[PDB]
Ligand SMILES: Nc1ncnc2c1ncn2[C@@H]1O[C@H](COP(=O)(O)OP(=O)(O)O)[C@@H](O)[C@H]1O
């Protein structure tokens with residue numbers, strides 16, 4: 160498959176001179192994946208694949224220029240490598256490769272649902288097989304930092320305001336989307352002017368058996384993280400705020 164990869168990297172214009180990008184692409188992505196990107200390119204969603212944003216155990220994220228709804232947009236292209244407790248029990252999904260495709264769709268559906276409810280996530284564009292295209296959060300091809308990446312710089316912001324933004328978003332996600340993120344933490348919240356939630360393939364509906372326990376986990380993480388910055392919050396008060404009690 161090595162020859163196919165290099166062949167698609169060539170068709171995608173991912174050049175040697177583009178830093179370490181080509182070698183990262185060729186290692187983290189396979190042929191069938193590149194075929195999909197090229198087909199998304201041919202369909203007109205992707206104009207130019209850009210730099211590598213994140214390489215992970217489950218997913219790889221890249222920058223691209225593309226077009227959505229008639230206009231040029233900056234995109235995060237998230238690609239799942241070709242889970243269980245988070246699928247089973249979520250009856251929306253009628254239950255190794257087909258499963259990565261379902262998770263991809265799940266994240267997409269979760270973004271759309273969260274988006275429609277007024278939660279701050281990246282506007283979802285499209286998905287195909289293991290590739291998801293969404294709004295790039297950041298500027299000049301530089302992603303907005305997650306809250307862990309902000310770090311001590313959080314001390315020079317209105318941390319209490321950021322905390323309340325986070326809470327408002329969880330409240331909307333629960334009350335209006337009827338979802339629970341289930342991996343909400345400082346690693347999965349970005350910030351530029353406002354918070355954005357990301358990473359939502361595992362999000363579940365309020366019908367999921369574990370939804371409440373997931374939510375309480377999410378709430379504790381947020382309380383724990385923000386306590387390091389002098390935000391005083393109570394588990395009981397935050398939980399009842401989210402759930403509308
Ligand atoms: N829409 C986006 N815009 C800009 N950067 C993004 C976007 N989505 C994800 N990223 C970057 O990629 C990183 C990993 O994405 P994430 O969805 O958290 O997957 P994982 O936890 O599997 O690596 C995020 O921490 C962020 O740094």
Ligand SMILES: [Mn+2]
Nearest residue numbers: 346347357358
């Ligand atoms: Mn993540």
